[PDB]
């Protein structure tokens, strides 16, 4: 038993991280086959960052202006293009460590592992959730741009995130592997606002099921409720409304524990209104919403 | 900025995990050079597990009684021996992905990354701290025995843990890579008790410094205290006594934030006596003790 925040094994992603330098700007890049993907703002000076015309700036850059390093081996750049906010550098060598991979755009509330790297060298790995306002609460220092988030299904790596910037509130922003930002953000040096964040209700319910499977107990009551009456409280505590589809995706856990979804909703309502009164759930004094139902099923079984 | 619980990149350790089967029992093994290290209880049936004489059981096992798989490649076992609670199987092939490695026995309060594997395939990675009672609060299911915990300095992997059992309280126990258990535990199928767990004070102080670095400052008071007066309060709330050496280890953080160790001890005293009054520190309602000072320095700088 046991339930901890868990990331995917990062070896398959470690095999693809490289270092990209343009002028004096150095960040990380993803090396897949004979292409290296990185943030386009690698081509910018401190002064271009205020209001950059990335098309004009990229036109002033030639292949030899990009220095790409994998370990002790430089990769000669033979082509370059721009897809949205992402720069694609075609190099002369195909990465022999290229795994079976996909480019996927995740929904808000879903989770993925982040491999924080600096100068192309992996530094750490940790689990993250896409907040409803399309930000993530990660750990990034200057030079971490190009680090990627991913999931792994058997032997296939679904890349879903590339880090670009940090917002004034301390949360982080980035794009998919096709250059499209998650949320209303742009890669300019301006203070940008994220929307109001809300709690992922289905994730809190999945986490409560995980707690029940692992022996945590005291919060379960012999009460029940309806979707309408539970939503009435969810609105009061800044929780997302609960839909019947969300009830359906909690089906496997509800069948494993033998506890109806609406019963767990009643328990959650009681926890929201009264608190915990000194107790913890899975060693936590707060209700966690960073675990999807699939994460719970994968970890506990 | 930001501060999440972070694990080391697991690729170097992924390159060493193999599957070891002895009879009907299958678990994980660590393949370094031409040796495979695993838990010895792999040679036990469900019947011997109650009170096994591992010498007698090992005597009745030959080299061919051990099946070792690295991926889809069979590793022919040419020798076998027992060192404490660890089984060493010498095979005919040396692991080409063997990293520079060390075997370390860690102190209570130090942290490391766990690579949970099943049937030789890595499943997840997460960060753990060795509790003062020599247990870890991890996530393990049946078949995870042989999974390892490690640290990485530059390019050297220091292995420090191998999982063996789960206690009745839900915590987990194991050995170092030389077979010696952490704590008073034995590898047999009995309900065993651990000592009283205490909070790692130096880790809580390092976590408070990390909070100050990332913007959280509300808990900083205009007060100071002596190590003796602080230990008086720490003894009441089940905190480990702070030593001058611990104060020295907190030196880099104290210099970076410009906040004396004793002033932060006063802040911790006030937090322990008054609570948090609804506020949070780094998005946490509890004082966290699973981050060493070096973890804080490495993550924030
Ligand atoms: C790339 O390595 C870098 C990562 C920063 S972090 C702290 O998240 O590791 N990215 C940036 O520095 C980006 C570059 C621009 C193209 C997106 N900028 C910011 O992260 C940034 C800019 C601001 C401003 O600008 C006015 C104001 C507040 C916060 C802020 N962050
Ligand atoms: C090995 O894969 C296995 C891991 C169990 S777990 C839940 O931690 O993933 N290890 C065991 O099953 C060990 C085997 C013996 C040699 C150490 N046993 C236990 O973990 C165990 C046995 C008990 C008993 O036995 C009466 C009672 C309570 C708890 C308990 N744990």
């Amino acid at each position: 038993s046991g339930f901890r925040k868990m990331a995917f094994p990062s070896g398959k992603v470690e095999g693809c991280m490289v270092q990209v330098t343009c002028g004096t700007t150095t960040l990380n890049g993803l090396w897949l086959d004979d292409v290296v993907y990185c943030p386009r703002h690698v081509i910018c000076t401190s002064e271009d960052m205020l209001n950059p015309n990335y098309e004009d700036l990229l036109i002033r850059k030639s292949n030899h202006n990009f220095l790409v390093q994998a370990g002790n081996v430089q990769l000669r750049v033979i082509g370059h293009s721009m897809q949205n906010c992402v720069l694609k550098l075609k190099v002369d060598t195909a990465n022999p460590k290229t795994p079976k991979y996909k480019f996927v755009r995740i929904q808000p509330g879903q989770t993925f592992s982040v491999l924080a790297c600096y100068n192309g060298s992996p530094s750490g790995v940790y689990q993250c959730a896409m907040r409803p306002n399309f930000t993530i609460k990660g750990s990034f220092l200057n030079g971490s741009c190009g680090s990627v988030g991913f999931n792994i299904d058997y032997d296939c790596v679904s890349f879903c995130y590339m880090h670009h910037m940090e917002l004034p509130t301390g949360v982080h922003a980035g794009t998919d592997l096709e250059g499209n930002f998650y949320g209303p953000f742009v890669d300019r040096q301006t203070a940008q606002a994220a929307g109001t964040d809300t709690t992922i209700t289905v994730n809190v319910l999945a986490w409560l099921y995980a707690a029940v499977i692992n022996g945590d107990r005291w919060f379960l009551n012999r009460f029940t409720t309806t979707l309408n009456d539970f939503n009435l409280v969810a609105m009061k505590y800044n929780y997302e409304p609960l839909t019947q589809d969300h009830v359906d995706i909690l089906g496997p856990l509800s069948a494993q524990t033998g506890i109806a979804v609406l019963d767990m909703c009643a328990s959650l309502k009681e926890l929201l209104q009264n608190g915990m009164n000194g107790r913890t759930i899975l060693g936590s004094a707060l209700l966690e919403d960073e675990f999807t139902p699939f994460d719970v099923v994968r970890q506990c079984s």
Side-chain angles (χ1 to χ4, degrees), chain A residues 20 42 49 78 86 114 120 129 132 148 176 222 231:
Chain A
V20 175
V42 69
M49 290 270 78
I78 60 155
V86 153
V114 170
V148 290
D176 57 18
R222 200 102 174 95
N231 283 334

Side-chain angles (χ1 to χ4, degrees), chain A residues 94-207:
Chain A
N95 186 10
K97 310 181 170 202
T98 305
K100 286 274 166 231
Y101 70 95
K102 293 171 32 159
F103 287 173
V104 64
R105 186 171 177 92
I106 44 147
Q107 305 287 95
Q110 296 187 308
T111 57
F112 57 95
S113 305
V114 170
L115 180 67
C117 318
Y118 299 92
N119 304 111
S121 303
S123 170
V125 61
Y126 53 89
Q127 196 74 353
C128 272
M130 177 67 70
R131 299 311 308 176
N133 63 3
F134 296 92
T135 61
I136 58 186
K137 306 169 172 178
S139 176
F140 301 94
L141 301 179
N142 201 10
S144 62
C145 296
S147 300
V148 290
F150 59 94
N151 287 280
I152 313 184
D153 203 340
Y154 186 51
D155 60 347
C156 182
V157 179
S158 297
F159 298 99
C160 64
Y161 179 81
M162 179 172 261
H163 176 62
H164 284 256
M165 63 200 299
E166 172 171 312
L167 300 188
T169 56
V171 300
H172 302 104
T175 68
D176 57 18
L177 259 296
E178 310 204 347
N180 294 120
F181 256 99
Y182 290 98
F185 309 115
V186 293
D187 48 351
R188 315 168 194 156
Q189 186 167 308
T190 41
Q192 297 159 53
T196 280
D197 200 20
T198 72
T199 298
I200 313 159
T201 306
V202 74
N203 282 8
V204 177
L205 288 166
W207 180 73

Side-chain angles (χ1 to χ4, degrees), chain A residues 54 78 220 257 282 292:
Chain A
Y54 285 101
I78 60 155
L220 283 174
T257 58
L282 290 174
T292 68

Side-chain angles (χ1 to χ4, degrees), chain A residues 20-22 42-43 58 61-68 74-75 77 80 87 89:
Chain A
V20 175
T21 298
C22 193
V42 69
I43 70 176
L58 189 62
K61 295 280 176 158
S62 155
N63 280 334
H64 61 271
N65 291 108
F66 301 99
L67 169 66
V68 170
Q74 141 177 318
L75 287 294
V77 195
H80 61 275
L87 207 65
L89 315 179

